[PDB]
Amino acid sequence: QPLNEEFRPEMLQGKKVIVTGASKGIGREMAYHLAKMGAHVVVTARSKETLQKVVSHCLELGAASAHYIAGTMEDMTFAEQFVAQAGKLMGGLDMLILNHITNTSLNLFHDDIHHVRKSMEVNFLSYVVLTVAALPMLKQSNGSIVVVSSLAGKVAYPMVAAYSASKFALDGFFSSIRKEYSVSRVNVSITLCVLGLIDTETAMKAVSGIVHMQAAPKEECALEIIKGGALRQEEVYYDSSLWTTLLIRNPSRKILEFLYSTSYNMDRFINK
Amino acid sequence: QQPLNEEFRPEMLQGKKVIVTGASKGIGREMAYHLAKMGAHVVVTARSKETLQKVVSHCLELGAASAHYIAGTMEDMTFAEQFVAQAGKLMGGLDMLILNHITNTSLNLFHDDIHHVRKSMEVNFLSYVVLTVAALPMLKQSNGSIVVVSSLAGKVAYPMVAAYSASKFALDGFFSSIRKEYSVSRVNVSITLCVLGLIDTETAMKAVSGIVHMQAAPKEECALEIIKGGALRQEEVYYDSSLWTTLLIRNPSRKILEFLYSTSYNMDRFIN
Ligand SMILES: NC(=O)c1ccc[n+]([C@@H]2O[C@H](COP(=O)([O-])OP(=O)(O)OC[C@H]3O[C@@H](n4cnc5c(N)ncnc54)[C@H](OP(=O)(O)O)[C@@H]3O)[C@@H](O)[C@H]2O)c1
Ligand SMILES: NC(=O)c1ccc[n+]([C@@H]2O[C@H](COP(=O)([O-])OP(=O)(O)OC[C@H]3O[C@@H](n4cnc5c(N)ncnc54)[C@H](OP(=O)(O)O)[C@@H]3O)[C@@H](O)[C@H]2O)c1
Ligand SMILES: C[C@](O)(c1ccc(C(=O)N(C2CC2)[C@H]2CC[C@](CCC(N)=O)(c3ccccc3)CC2)cc1)C(F)(F)F
Ligand SMILES: C[C@](O)(c1ccc(C(=O)N(C2CC2)[C@H]2CC[C@](CCC(N)=O)(c3ccccc3)CC2)cc1)C(F)(F)F
């Protein structure tokens, strides 16, 4: 259930926001847009130094306030405590942007069970832990959770098997709890972001000299994420391909969820 | 992946070497039985030792070429790995790996139980990956098949089954991706993903007792349909008691989209 109007930057002014994986790439881009909009930001990642750079530019850009707390989202204790500390720094929370992933490479799957588990722990499970911890704050602000996923969390590509497992898991979990928030009247929005290849240094280094589809700009990607999030959209799509509309516009899933969503809808085609 | 264009006939399994997990009860047990009637060699597994022994007996009675059981929990990755080697030895190889077991769950709103989420991912998903890695060399030898049992709720969202849907979405992501890897690497092992609606197994029927519109499909037919899809090397089996649902759950447009992505570079240019 989105917000009616069109996006205005004014919407984030004074809002209290967490961005994870925000020392590099898209997370850093998002932090910068949030700063320019005059939000309070807490950013996180493992690296002390790179987070400081981002904090400094955020303040320069006009952020109501800016802070960083460092640590690995492999540590579910850290994840849980991080949201607590970040909520103290800002006096509440309006938007939780879940963006970090564990380092991965483009490669055939062979037998790296430990990579599959780590991808699942860092890319999926840590997001559930951060959500549980943030939810009381979000409940009292009528806030928003933004979950960064990928085209590879909607369709199958080779070379990203463990990664794709974890992005699909995000769709299943968060789309399910969105249905639960709706039956339990929890006014917290959940936005799933489905991104094409984006020109972050990590990705551009991986695809160097291999044949692949155009990368889209990270800066606009980051604004489009914040906009869909602020507007409380269920999904945000950002990529460069003409083909992607085949995914975006397929209404089958929405039709099925609708058919099964009430006893009255199931009564159309199913005996009581 | 190429489906065999021959019609299904019971003889396709006679003397074939087949694993079935989750076979002490429900669909799994039904599958073991069907495979017995076809004269396959079966190794069955689950945690319930005395129920499995019973299952092995009725199997032999129905005409299984050989029938053994090894008991253990798929919470334990070591055991998953162990189970496959030992089951191979018992049969002289492996033609089909049928992955069917899930960890217990109930129909409830998710609150804060990260541990049940993790355990779901470990058992319903990570174990399936361990079993596959352990099975692959033998399935290469035989040009065999991997069958992965999943659910409507691994394709669309439902409330009350969040951790469970995460694990089932994860299976789609992982196995659909390694299927693309197997086509480009020319590995001749098929991957069939089965998408089931509500089935009339005792676990499910208990959990939905007294709930309205709970139309279940018969587990006996369900089990046959999975075996056929596996045997015919189909990419997906769709099985539900509603005709509408069975039609609407097809997603050929994702498969076309996947092809387009695999044959595009730069601004949607064709590689060939
Ligand atoms: N770039 C693409 O082509 C693309 C496409 C589709 C979707 N996405 C999605 O967009 C999001 C951001 O991607 P990106 O390419 O911008 O990534 P990135 O630039 O490589 O940055 C990843 C961020 O996560 C942090 N990180 C890595 N491991 C961590 C850990 N264990 N604990 C805490 N933080 C950790 C990194 O900082 P530290 O190393 O210091 O911890 C960094 O801040 C991801 O969710 C990704 O799936 C990207
Ligand atoms: N029933 C439905 O309405 C429905 C719908 C869609 C999809 N499915 C799928 O169909 C498959 C089977 O479902 P079902 O209804 O037949 O299930 P079930 O009757 O409840 O039995 C599940 C099987 O998994 C085994 N199992 C449980 N925990 C285990 C563990 N830790 N390690 C190893 N095995 C374990 C159980 O045996 P033990 O207790 O002896 O270990 C049992 O044999 C599942 O993958 C499920 O997701 C079912
Ligand atoms: C972590 C990482 O930065 C990463 C970046 C993005 C993604 C991802 O989400 N995408 C999905 C959104 C499209 C991948 C898909 C595979 C890809 C596109 C293939 C094509 N058809 O265009 C490809 C695979 C193999 C070779 C070359 C390209 C590259 C992009 C995953 C990991 C890495 F790993 F370091 F790069
Ligand atoms: C383990 C278990 O036996 C189980 C059985 C099946 C499934 C499953 O895969 N299905 C998907 C295939 C359809 C569920 C989805 C939710 C469901 C359908 C909702 C509706 N509108 O039809 C429902 C939710 C809430 C209340 C009542 C029903 C029941 C069926 C998951 C777990 C349990 F948990 F013990 F039951």
Curated annotation (Swiss-Prot), chain B:
Tissues expressing this chain: Widely expressed, highest expression in liver, lower in testis, ovary, lung, foreskin fibroblasts, and much lower in kidney. Expressed in liver (at protein level). Expressed in the basal cells of the corneal epithelium and in the ciliary nonpigmented epithelium (both at mRNA and at protein level).
- Describe activation and inhibition of this protein: Hexose-6-phosphate dehydrogenase (H6PD) provides cosubstrate NADPH, and the glucose-6-phosphate transporter in the ER-membrane supplies the substrate for H6PDH, their activities stimulate the reduction of cortisone and abolish the oxidation of cortisol.
Q: Which GO terms describe its biological process?
A: lung development; steroid catabolic process
E.C. code: 1.1.1.146, 1.1.1.201
The record lists the effect of residue 6 to K/Q as: No effect on activity
In the UniProt record, which residues carry a glycan?
Answer: 104, 143, 188
All ranges on the Lumenal side of the membrane: 6-272
Assembly, per entry: Homodimer.
Name the record gives this protein = 11-beta-hydroxysteroid dehydrogenase 1
Organism source for this protein? Homo sapiens (Human)
Tell me the gene name: HSD11B1
